[PDB]
Amino acid sequence: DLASLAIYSFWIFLAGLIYYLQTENMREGYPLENEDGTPAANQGPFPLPKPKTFILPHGRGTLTVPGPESEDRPIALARTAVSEGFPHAPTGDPMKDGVGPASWVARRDLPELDGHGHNKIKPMKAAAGFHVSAGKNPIGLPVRGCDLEIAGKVVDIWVDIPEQMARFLEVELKDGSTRLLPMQMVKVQSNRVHVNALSSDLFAGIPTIKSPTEVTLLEEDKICGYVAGGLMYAAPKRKS
Template sequence: MDDVKIVGTLDVTQLVFYAFVLFFIALVFYLRREDRREGYPTEAEDTGMPDTMGGPLSRAAPKTFDLPHGQGTVSPDGERRERVDLPAKRAFGSNGAPYVPTGDPFADGLGPAAWAERMHTPDLTASGKPRIVPLSSTDHVSVSPRDPNPVGMPVIGADGETAGMVTEAWVDMSEHHIRYLEIGDAETPGSASPKPVVVETQTVAAVDPATETAVVVETESVRTPASGGPGTGALLVPMAMAKIRKRKGVIVVDALRADQFAGAPRPATPGQITLNEEERIVAYFGGGYLYADPQRQEPII
């Protein structure tokens, strides 16, 4: 017996097949749009111009995130995109060549000193309270008697000089461990007065990719903590980059020289630190492992 025809030679089997094909095509377009919400359209490395190939069917609407504790919503926008006008030169004329700083890499945020533009609000606990707070502001978190208390210990830089005295510890209220050490002057513990930081003259050799000629740049600058970060409050050192020498009673931070500590970014609000300020502080100290001393940029062998 012949199959039941709906219209002409169109039967149920053909109708199901056509519906499946249309569904599959729509599914492919949907998946391709969804997997391009973040990171697309791709951009040229040197100019930052977007790649518009693919048309509107390959790009989805911007993703919107609902923030907890009534903080509203956030969506990726142009203000938080990576910069392309960097004060740096390519080490040699080739795509993928490393960039050599031509200015102050700490302030410019290059290489290991780079940071991401995170939100200018504090990180919060599950209950909606600031997550990173000074130890003295809480009464149910304390340093274990079995561990050395860093408060009162001097902080030694990579050059063996004293950068200051620990005056406070900032703790993580969600994980209950020290995240930052607040330091002041060695002469006047507790004070966090900004000091100018002298950056010695450095000669940097690079190759201009446009002319393929060598470029020699000499830089010399004097800056203060205000120019190195978003605020001029407490001087905070990431605990992850500090080594407590219990027997000697000192804390060693070999990321920076002692005179470079004062140039670190500082929180703008007393007793509070935002996600963006955390990013800037960690980037500053992380960049010191390469830029604190010109010798650190040289080959090991």
């Protein structure tokens, strides 16, 4: 009967769909590698999909995936065991070296652009008509690290312009230069901004941006990577 036919066909459709979904989800990160970066012998039962090409919006070119995978950066880790499956220990300072929870990827060293081809993220002072709308304005607040010491003062908010959202606090340090802190990694309080992930002495080490009115994708990855890594690697100094 038609209902047995239908359910029979459906199971076949579903297996095909899962097969399609799994291979689509292999457009990044494959082939699988050994710990030394050479191709693993066992790739699984799904082969790679035929490549697709995205056309990028502002003369920025295309992306074709799957394609040749490569970290494009040194990775300061070494094996801790003589067989596969164990951790790899930082060979230096994992925060400065950008490994473990402090990792960053080699994204393009250009800012994300909005639909009109303008920089998506800007310091509020350079963003016409933007202002604090609701909530405690953090600008001017002292910034406190997990060691309960003051690391600097908030001098601006970096806003997402098309999405009208706060993305970073710009924080000025004792020596007069500034750093960006991810909004998601700060707690705005009535009399301070509190930064759980970093002790005061780690603020100087936040990666800097090469131009003071824009951030590149590569820069945001280094900053966000570095601050999140403090949760594991400051932790000695953090005192709750």
